[PDB]
Ligand binder design. Structure first.
Ligand SMILES: OC[C@H]1O[C@H](Oc2c[nH]c3ccc(Br)c(Cl)c23)[C@@H](O)[C@@H](O)[C@@H]1O
Ligand SMILES: OC[C@H]1O[C@H](Oc2c[nH]c3ccc(Br)c(Cl)c23)[C@@H](O)[C@@H](O)[C@@H]1O
Ligand SMILES: OC[C@H]1O[C@H](Oc2c[nH]c3ccc(Br)c(Cl)c23)[C@@H](O)[C@@H](O)[C@@H]1O
Ligand SMILES: OC[C@H]1O[C@H](Oc2c[nH]c3ccc(Br)c(Cl)c23)[C@@H](O)[C@@H](O)[C@@H]1O
Ligand SMILES: [Ca+2]
Ligand SMILES: [Ca+2]
Ligand SMILES: [Ca+2]
Ligand SMILES: [Ca+2]
Ligand SMILES: [Mn+2]
Ligand SMILES: [Mn+2]
Ligand SMILES: [Mn+2]
Ligand SMILES: [Mn+2]
Lengths: 236, 236, 236, 236
């Protein structure tokens, strides 16, 4: 199975697999059962912004999600990612729906990775930004139902004509491998931002959006729909 | 008195004011008596590199100092800087000598600050880099004995002709105020790197180099030589 | 007198001092009488975006101004700025009104400068961004009528209560000097972006907004209102 | 055949295919017969640094190559690349040897691309840096004889044990496609830097190093050794 480090924006409480009894932001380490969560309140149809950062000295993955004029929700978790992830990863977003549904629209996405080795190189770095998406994005690996629409949004899950579809899954990974640790490595860091638009006609949205880091050859696991956010093959 | 948040590379153990019994990297919050330290071994006359990062969600100031081919020393400390620092600060380096002495040469320095407010601006940012210093650096506030030499090094303490001088103090602050928190602020971060060259003809070097963040109008306090690193007026 | 290199977004044709018979973007070298212009059509009350870039090998200052869904206006001019500007400059925006008037609102501003010397340093660099302005921006030198309003816009000229005022002048310079050439310099570059909002209740707006680079101690010259854009003391 | 825009650092004069009678930096547009060149003097065994920049408003590709303490060689050429290149490209370095030989060692490489569309997005961007190369660089497409050595240099052509080999060709492309123009595009830019080490035991080195931009699926053309720099299938 894949190796997954993820930040989930979780729109639908699944109490049987560890979700708290409310919508929440979470830190996922090799499991859908978040290691930490914070209460977060979806604002139907508004543009949200998520920020994720980490560095290998501090060893603390943090995430914060906000809406305009509104107070934010943040979460943190002490973790040494370099003992978890492989040296080379891909990064991405995913989203899913189940019996309940929502738009999982990404409006923009940026990422930065830095590796600083002893000698004293500013040793290797990657920064990408998208503030909209090309109708045919050649630098994105599109998985499952993910596509870009003609407003240049990235629609991670199916929408037929304003209307989000149930039991949909989709993921976009940046085309280049990222080098996240090395043998002669002194400090590695990353920071990602994405803005997103979650809308539902139902009183209850599902299932969420996640930012995630995985083995380079990660693909959507079998059985990963709805609650498992296209990240995991099961709920362990 | 000034408000000081600093990372010290401390070359000389002052056991009467809290230094551990070895050279050490430290985190200083409003006091010379570090809140956290880690053993570090000065390599006389080699080029060292220090990295410092922080963000306001994770709330963990970390620092790591390394030399080429060598293992590093890191330190961390959980702190909410936004409850400590003012909204606007300056950033800088300082150094001092006392009865013992060393070159406090900076070879390069970069800094990044980011403030992200709710609305969803990438709201305000500053990045500067120097990989050498102009003989007359108009974007640096030079304090005390700080000057740039004709190899374009920043000599924070006095050197007359290869030879570091005792009881010297010096500081360089970047000319622009940095905006580190706001009312509508969601996350603030910074990262600094500097490379430095500490040399002594004595068996024992003193006193150290620090990176620091202070009120914009911070200046060298009276009585801040030697052990107090040009950061503090006393040892409380 | 000051040394001025500027890109003007010129809203009002002054045919007696060289303006073409239409609103226009221009390149100004030590004179209000642009060295090059291109036709540009103000869209009353829309948000515009201007981009300016230069590097010292290519020796070609270019500028382009656009509005959403609309085609842009670009201009270029072959110039060696390093033989014109001093080694250290400040950068800024200015704006003016005269008998005719407009809002000269800046919504955001970013700038980048890079100097690469032979040895092979990435030798010195500055990047700043603002996507809104602090009610009390300590890293901006505010001149004349320039102020930030409570939406965090930078109002370069006077507006009393929705309404732009006639015979107003204002400028904002970034607080730090920029190092634009050196003796051992191989290539120097800069790029600036700003977004702006020009509105008038009159059929005819005046006078314009400019991005500009000047001696560090540049201030608004006497007699520089209206057509001279707060850049020049006269029209030579 | 491939579509090639390249900057060549050309170590060996081939007078029968248009080379001037000296080592030279050149701008190549769809042909090995440079559109512009400047005299450049290889310094055997020193570390050189090359800078390349372009933007689509100015429409002027420029390049400059320097060695430490030394004066540089620059070249420029007025070209609209967006009418030449496809919307999506890859970028890379290549090098070759023939009957004469040299090390074609890259010590570091960085690239930046920016696309700014009307609406007013900072619309899409890529920045990568390498200051050394991983023994197994998963984010580089290695072609022909290109490999990384155990000092973490990128050896574009064969070296067996200090000694550069004759009739060798090699190329490294960054793994991700770059988006260089769009339909709603206002301005596109890029800047690349690389540092390199060319050494020969012969009195006469050959053949050179190039930075290049090509269709995403570009590979080494048949018959492109020696003088054609691994860029072209012939000399037209
Ligand atoms: O989209 C929300 C949820 O929908 C499904 O679970 C159900 C939520 N309400 C139900 C009602 C009936 C049945 Br059968 C099911 Cl599986 C469900 C499943 O797809 C869950 O994974 C998902 O989290
Ligand atoms: O530079 C090292 C140290 O030198 C001075 O302290 C002394 C170290 N050895 C001594 C021996 C005698 C006397 Br008096 C003094 Cl003050 C000292 C003081 O300046 C200290 O602040 C400094 O840390
Ligand atoms: O704001 C537009 C213009 O207004 C003034 O010029 C006039 C434009 N129409 C006029 C009508 C009468 C008189 Br008096 C004047 Cl000075 C003007 C002057 O302030 C000009 O500098 C400015 O460009
Ligand atoms: O490496 C330098 C040059 O070597 C070859 O050309 C020759 C240079 N001197 C020669 C002498 C004899 C013969 Br046969 C040849 Cl092909 C050559 C060819 O490989 C050229 O493409 C290359 O530019
Ligand atoms: Ca859930
Ligand atoms: Ca001490
Ligand atoms: Ca005018
Ligand atoms: Ca040749
Ligand atoms: Mn959950
Ligand atoms: Mn100490
Ligand atoms: Mn004009
Ligand atoms: Mn040639």
């Amino acid at each position: 199975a894949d190796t997954i480090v993820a930040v989930e924006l979780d729109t639908y409480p699944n109490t049987d697999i560890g979700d708290p009894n409310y919508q929440h932001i979470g830190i996922n380490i090799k499991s859908i059962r978040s290691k930490a969560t914070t209460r977060w309140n979806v604002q139907d149809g508004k543009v949200g912004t998520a920020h994720i950062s980490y560095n290998s000295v501090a060893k603390r993955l943090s995430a914060i999600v906000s809406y305009p004029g509104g107070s934010s929700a943040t979460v943190s978790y002490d973790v040494d990612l370099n003992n978890i992830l492989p040296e080379w990863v891909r990064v991405g977003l995913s989203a899913s729906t189940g019996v309940y549904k929502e738009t999982n629209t990404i409006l923009s996405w940026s990422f930065t990775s830095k590796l600083k080795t002893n000698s004293t190189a500013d040793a290797q770095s990657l920064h990408f930004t998208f503030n909209q998406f090309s109708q045919s994005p050649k630098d994105l690996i599109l998985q499952g139902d993910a596509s870009t629409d003609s407003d240049g949004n990235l629609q991670l899950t199916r929408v037929s004509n304003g209307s989000p579809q149930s039991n949909s899954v989709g993921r976009a990974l940046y085309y280049a491998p990222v080098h996240v640790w090395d043998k002669s490595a002194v400090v590695a860091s990353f920071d990602a931002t994405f803005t997103f638009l979650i809308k539902s006609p139902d009183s209850d949205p599902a299932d969420g959006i996640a930012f995630f880091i995985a083995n380079t050859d990660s693909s959507i696991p079998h059985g990963s729909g709805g609650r498992l956010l296209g990240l995991f093959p099961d709920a362990n």
